[PDB]
Amino acid sequence: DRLVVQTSSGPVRGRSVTVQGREVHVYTGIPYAKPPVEDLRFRKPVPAEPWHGVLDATGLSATCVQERYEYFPGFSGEEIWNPNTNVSEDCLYINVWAPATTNGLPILIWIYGGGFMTGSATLDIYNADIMAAVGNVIVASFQYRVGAFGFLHLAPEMPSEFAEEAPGNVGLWDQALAIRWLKDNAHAFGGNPEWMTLFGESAGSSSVNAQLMSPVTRGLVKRGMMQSGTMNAPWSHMTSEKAVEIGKALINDCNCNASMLKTNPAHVMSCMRSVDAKTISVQQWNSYSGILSFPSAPTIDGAFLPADPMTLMKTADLKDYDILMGNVRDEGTYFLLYDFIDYFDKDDATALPRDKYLEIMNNIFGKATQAEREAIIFQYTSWEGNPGYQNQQQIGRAVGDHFFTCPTNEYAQALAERGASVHYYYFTHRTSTSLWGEWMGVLHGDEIEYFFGQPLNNSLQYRPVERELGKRMLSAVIEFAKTGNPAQDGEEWPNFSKEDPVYYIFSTDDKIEKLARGPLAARCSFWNDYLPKVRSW
């Protein structure tokens, strides 16, 4: 078959789609690791046993075990992020979209987000059909273990012998393993293996970050696109000691004692591999208190992540790295609606009084000092623009700014200082069909479909300028993948640095100035310059 490709591990058969007037060959569900199941739960992934026989790569693969948000039962806007294939631990599968400088096609690799607890390469929104077809590039995506399955971290609690029992970050080992698989097999799909670009969003973006900077993997890929996610972000890294404590709680939470981890770890681990995945899937969430602070995150392990993400950079040079990164306008709105659903509504705005503005602010930042809390509350106090609506708008800004936009900004400046050619974007279009509430603005993740070129899909409802924006945002990705520079011919989009923190604005509004420096600079000046000084007692 011409839909058959001989991979490193055996022949695979795929589908043929014709989108945007070009043939793509779509291979979905290729095992890249042995199913991380039974004895291999919590462990590093091991390469998949080779096969022979055409492997059916025409259906979607499984979704790694996770829980579905049902805060709005039946609301399409929530469940399009829920798993759309069966959930199972057997989930380590790769997807390749392959069209029908000169030694093969560029390969783009997508890592999804979902806070290291959720997410799946199989979501419609991550369909690489159009990107591959129009970009004329190889696009690949894959599942990686999330939640406690990907991030249970207990090795310090156990003797040397039991290191590989629960080393932590195996979800990042998964990604490492799938990217290795794609390098190995780039040529078999018409792809140039030295021409690879990682890209992702939220936790996927931070994972792009980890894969570029980890000693375990660094050098393999040196060109990445990070959408609203950087490892310095508070939700995207976690100490080993906190990870262990979460792990110890989970072990207890699944009725497995955990106080025997030192005296007899092997038995505690057997117990945890006998637990049904659904039980882990639920009990891991007991350790979630704090908006945007998940129990699973890239963990300082002296291995994949050997130091805290900002002490990594003071010593490694990045002159050969190309980085495209950015943010959406309202990063924090849906996190705030979910974590404070008692206060807020999905569809309409909330006139939030001043005491309940304080109630929420003082909670979100309860772990900062009160000199920070007072400073933050003062920085986000509305005075104009009709109260209440404005207060909700400011708490959203604060969440977005503290958790995504300003960490991204800070990491973008640190990447530029060590030589990386950084390009920064800011996404400010609220899609016309968005059925999230108007007050929620331009949601975290709203940009993913645009960068994938989905507005080019004439079967989904979009306005002509939105299809223009999708064609522009996909083209920024394809040009970044192809040249390390997102800028089109004659389009001005200069490098981002501390000296000139210029970013590109993606909007349908042809009246705005596309290049801007000041507004993000001021927003995040508070978080990245002034607030550190407040923290000095």
Ligand X SMILES: Ic1cccc(CNc2c3c(nc4ccccc24)CCCC3)c1
Ligand Y SMILES: *[C@@H]1O[C@H](CO)[C@@H](O[C@@H]2O[C@H](CO)[C@@H](O[C@@H]3O[C@H](CO)[C@@H](O)[C@H](O)[C@@H]3O)[C@H](O)[C@H]2NC(C)=O)[C@H](O)[C@H]1NC(C)=O
Interacting residue ranges for its own copies, rule: CB under 8 A: 371, 374-375, 378, 381, 383-384, 518-519, 521-522, 525-526, 530, 533-534
Q: Give min distance, CB of 133 to ligand Y, in A.
A: 7
Identify which range of 126-134, 278-286, 309-317, 340-348 contacts ligand Y by CB under 6 A.
126-134
- Tell me the residue number closest to ligand Y, measured at CB: 459
Q: Write the single-letter amino acid at 66.
A: Q
Position 459 contacts ligand Y (CB under 6 A): yes
State the pairing for strand pair 93-99/138-142.
antiparallel
Q: Which does 522 bind (CB under 5 to 8 A by kind): ligand Y, ligand X, its own copies, none?
A: its own copies
Classified as helix, coil or strand, 449 is helix
Check if the beta carbon of residue 42 is closer than 8 Å to that of residue 170: yes
Within 10 Å of residue 275's Cβ, how many Cβ atoms?
Answer: 18
Closest to its own copies by CB, 342 or 513: 513
Closest to its own copies by CB, 278 or 535: 535
Scan residues 108-127 and list those touching ligand X (CB under 6 A): 113-115, 117-119
Check if the beta carbon of residue 145 is closer than 8 Å to that of residue 31: no
Distance CA 122, CA 113 (A): 12
Check if the beta carbon of residue 473 is closer than 8 Å to that of residue 451: yes
Position 460 contacts ligand Y (CB under 6 A): yes
Task: Based on the residue annotation, tell me whether 267 is a catalytic residue of this protein.
Answer: no
Alpha helices in 299-388 (DSSP H): 309-313, 333-339, 354-364, 370-379
Closest to ligand X by CB, 82 or 257: 82
CA 536 to chain centre: 32
Task: Based on the residue annotation, tell me whether 202 is a catalytic residue of this protein.
Answer: yes
For the four alpha carbons of 55, 169, 84 and 328, in that order, the dihedral sign comes to negative
Check if the beta carbon of residue 233 is closer than 8 Å to that of residue 404: yes
Q: Which does 185 bind (CB under 5 to 8 A by kind): ligand Y, ligand X, its own copies, none?
A: none
Within 10 Å of residue 418's Cβ, how many Cβ atoms?
Answer: 14
Position 69 contacts ligand X (CB under 6 A): yes
Query: Nearest 5 degrees, angle CA 165-CA 285-CA 162?
Result: 10
Q: Give min distance, CB of 114 to ligand X, in A.
A: 4
Distance CA 468, CA 126 (A): 19
Within 10 Å of residue 485's Cβ, how many Cβ atoms?
Answer: 15
Position 83 contacts ligand X (CB under 6 A): no
Q: Give min distance, CB of 228 to ligand X, in A.
A: 9
Alpha helices in 153-202 (DSSP H): 170-185
Q: Give min distance, CB of 458 to its own copies, in A.
A: 41
Q: Give min distance, CB of 529 to its own copies, in A.
A: 8
Q: Give min distance, CB of 92 to its own copies, in A.
A: 47
Closest to ligand X by CB, 81 or 151: 81
The DSSP 8-state label assigned to residue 368 in this structure reads S
Distance CA 404, CA 408 (A): 6
Position 81 contacts ligand X (CB under 6 A): yes
Closest to its own copies by CB, 349 or 534: 534
Check if the beta carbon of residue 474 is closer than 8 Å to that of residue 368: no
Classified as helix, coil or strand, 343 is coil
Position 51 contacts ligand X (CB under 6 A): no
Check if the beta carbon of residue 122 is closer than 8 Å to that of residue 41: no
x-or-dash string of contact with ligand Y, 15-44, rule CB under 6 A:
----x-------------------------
Position 331 contacts ligand X (CB under 6 A): no
Q: Pick left, alpha or beta for residue 290 (phi over 0 → left; psi -120 to 50 → alpha; otherwise beta).
A: left
Task: Based on the residue annotation, tell me whether 499 is a catalytic residue of this protein.
Answer: no
Catalytic residue of the set 78, 89, 165, 331: 331
Q: Give min distance, CB of 8 to ligand X, in A.
A: 30
Catalytic residue of the set 202, 206, 281, 296: 202
Closest to ligand Y by CB, 130 or 272: 130
Q: Which does 181 bind (CB under 5 to 8 A by kind): ligand Y, ligand X, its own copies, none?
A: none
Closest to its own copies by CB, 294 or 426: 426
Write out the catalytic residue numbers. Answer: 202, 331, 444
- Which residues contact ligand Y by CB under 6 A? 19, 127, 129-130, 457, 459-460
